[PDB]
Paper text:
There are two human NMT enzymes and they have been explored as therapeutic targets for malaria, sleeping sickness, common cold, and cancer. Unexpectedly, we found that human NMT1 and NMT2 can catalyze lysine myristoylation of ARF6 providing an explanation for its unusual membrane association.
Analogous to the higher-resolution NMT2 structure with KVLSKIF peptide, we still observed continuous electron density between the lysine and the myristoyl, with a loss of electron density connecting the CoA sulfur to the myristoyl. Following that region, we found a long hydrophobic pocket (~23 Å) that emerges from the active site of NMT1 and NMT2.
Numbering used by the authors:
A (entry chain D): 3 to 9
B (entry chain B): 117 to 315, 317 to 496
C (entry chain A): 116 to 409, 414 to 496
D (entry chain C): 2 to 9
């Protein structure tokens, strides 16, 4: 659902 | 919010101390579908028809969720979409697409699947809402609420008045907020495509920081088999009682959700010396399309699903999860910070992500909980 | 004694109940294996979309299903009726549980379940309704019915449902309520001739016929067949009307389309639309003829009748007229809900058959027939 | 329905 990535 | 002040949800900031619904169950329900902008019609997609299934795959592949900086896009597979959209109890009316009348081109979709949900002290039949998608050409033309009102109506006709769904955006009013963390498996590729970044720290050093064992350490770890379904079900049910928002799955739903399918779902059980299955780990397969990179098209990501421990330590279980993903060719392993995942994220060298994940209940008034109390992993 | 039902989560025949709740907890692991059929038989899930299996199922029920006291009549459920009763919304082919002979594959057994939201006193719980338990006559008195029950119970458990509702003509442990069938004669010539009834004495055939004479068109103002546009108000009416009783179904609008929208030879619904154009009452009655052994009594069965402005008395009178007009020989209504207030007055007769209502895996107080609010096919 | 009744 959420395409997060490295912060 | 102009749309959500009309819906049976609590407001942002009103804190809640009652438990229950917002508006009563409907004694009579609209018979007619909501009105679409001129030139478009509703169509229930038959996913058994491979052409329609293909159509739905393309719509999502070209128009679904992108990351924060618009460099990656989900690439749910057709077979993944059948696993996610046809669990036990699915209805063809709940695969609600929108088409161009002239060409029958698909430009919208939203779906609901039935699910028993447990929240605090209540179990109620609900629906899970997923894949709200509007063709890029049709964005901000007010079509998404039309989709929402229509799916709400079709669920209402089958007698269900509560829902659960997630979103990357803050809406009124989250029942819980989770955070995605990402563990690198192929740091070379993730960094090459700008999914992550060298923390000055030499890449060669970075390459050996995320290196893993060639094989899993846990004893008697093997793929889930048919004979494991009752014991998996048992393990999951008892484990889920510490959280406040969980699914209540029948043995049939446990078969559907956990029995291994190549390139969709992977499950591994731990069978000990007595032959008793004592723990299991699971993760599903969802790659993302990487845009405008000439040599790097898609990143293979594993998403943790439901991991239960009764004798193996959770850390060791998740370690072997990382190992198995690695062996299978995944570039990254993603996990939320819910249930007990905070207890092992840093130690296995995951980094936190930039996206949040809000959980929402429709027409259900209750207090919000911390991420650790969330026990539901949606597709 | 009850060797089978003593192993089940049902209350004993004698115990008085003071509690509300399940008898046993929901099971977190369910037997994956089908139960054992005696040597020479196998299980089969019947796909009723196939007209061949549907007919096999029909031939089996027509030849081996319920008979009356004197073995004179037998239900003659038709294919289309069985499709209506066994394919409501949420039906499963696995719950159409038949038994076949391994060698010849002939259908010799059956049991069925369908999903149903049931409201009982203060609880709404997902249950199933169990109907059409049938074993071929050559196969009776040898423990196939218990195996059918355990296999359907297992198959319901696999879907996460742990309670059931069912009726029976026999006294089992433990009836949640006891109801009684009453009959209103419509064509007494045929009825007395085939021994469904008898001349009550000190009376003639001609006098008898003038007793059951009916008007040829109904009394109520604004009665008409139910139409598509009426599915919401019927649903509304039913939902509000059913809240007075202690054992009722909870239908979604879809289940109402399915259970009440009219079908030739199956279900008939009539609504009352008043001067203002509001539907205010409705009547329902379904078609189930019984074979006359040794050719076919045609019977109509009261289903759900909701009144808010028309007196129930007039509603049921018009029901009798409508049935009479459609060619039915007899009108059978139970004595549950508010039916006691019109059975005598409308000249129904009492039957010999009782109908016991039962809950599986649910302990609760028993109710009098007036509080039972559930009609099964 | 279940009970095949007739006039008592
Ligand atoms: C999400 C998407 C369908 C939005 O549709 P859209 O037509 O651009 O948005 P609309 O014109 O309906 O905008 C109005 C409403 O859409 C809603 N909306 C947008 N994205 C939403 C989501 N993921 N969930 C719920 N509502 C959403 C807003 O809640 C808004 O209501 P508000 O005014 O009360 O905030 C579209 O951006 C898309 O395809 N994104 C991919 C899926 C996704 O990001 N989730
Ligand atoms: C219903 C039918 C399958 C009974 O099977 P059978 O072979 O006669 O008898 P069995 O020895 O197989 O079954 C006996 C057990 O079945 C159970 N049983 C009997 N009739 C039953 C019924 N109608 N519903 C549920 N269970 C029933 C009883 O609990 C009994 O256990 P008990 O020893 O505790 O009483 C069979 O007579 C038949 O098909 N009848 C035609 C349709 C019919 O009669 N339906 C139900 C009649 S009330
Ligand atoms: C009772 C049925 C309510 C159905 C609608 C619930 C609200 C939907 C919000 C949109 C959810 C987006 C999740 C993704 O896809
Ligand atoms: C009349 O045809 C059918 C016989 C009634 C069956 C007895 C009750 C069995 C309940 C079975 C399913 C229970 C699921 C929890």
């Amino acid at each position: 659902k959420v395409l997060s990535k490295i912060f | 919010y102009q749309f959500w002040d009309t819906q049976p949800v609590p407001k942002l900031g009103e804190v809640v101390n009652t438990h229950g619904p917002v508006e009563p169950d409907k004694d009579n329900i609209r018979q007619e579908p909501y009105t679409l902008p001129q030139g478009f019609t509703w169509d229930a997609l038959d996913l058994g028809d491979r052409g329609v299934l293909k159509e739905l795959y393309t719509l999502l592949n070209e128009n679904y969720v992108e990351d924060d900086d618009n460099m990656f896009r989900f690439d749910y597979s057709p077979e993944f979409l059948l696993w996610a959209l046809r669990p036990p109890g699915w209805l063809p009316q709940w695969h609600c697409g929108v088409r161009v009348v002239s060409s029958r081109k698909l430009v919208g979709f939203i779906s609901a699947i039935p699910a028993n949900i447990h929240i605090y002290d209540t179990e109620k039949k609900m629906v899970e809402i997923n894949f709200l998608c509007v063709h890029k050409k049709l964005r901000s033309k007010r079509v998404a609420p039309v989709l929402i009102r229509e799916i709400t109506r079709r669920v209402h006709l089958e007698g269900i008045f509560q829902a659960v769904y997630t979103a990357g955006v803050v809406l009124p009013k989250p029942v819980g907020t989770c955070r995605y963390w990402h563990r690198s498996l192929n740091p070379r590729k993730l960094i090459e495509v700008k999914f992550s970044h060298l923390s000055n720290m030499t890449m060669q050093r970075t390459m050996k920081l995320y290196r893993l064992p060639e094989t899993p350490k846990t004893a008697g770890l093997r793929p889930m088999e048919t004979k494991d379904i009752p014991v998996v079900h048992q393990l999951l049910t008892r484990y889920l009682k510490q959280f406040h928002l969980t699914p209540v799955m029948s043995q049939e739903e446990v078969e559907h959700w956990f029995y291994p399918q190549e390139n969709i779902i992977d499950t591994f059980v731990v069978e000990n010396a007595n032959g008793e299955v004592t723990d299991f780990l699971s993760f599903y397969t969802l790659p993302s399309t990487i845009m405008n990179h000439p040599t790097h098209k898609s990143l293979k990501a594993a998403y943790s699903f439901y991991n239960v421990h009764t004798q193996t330590p959770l850390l060791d279980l998740m370690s072997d999860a990382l190992v198995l993903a690695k062996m299978k060719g995944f570039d990254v392993f993603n996990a939320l910070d819910l249930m007990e995942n905070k207890t092992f994220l840093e130690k296995l060298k995951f980094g936190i992500g930039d996206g949040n994940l809000q959980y929402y209940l429709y027409n259900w008034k209750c207090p919000s909980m911390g991420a650790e109390k969330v026990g539901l992993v949606l597709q």
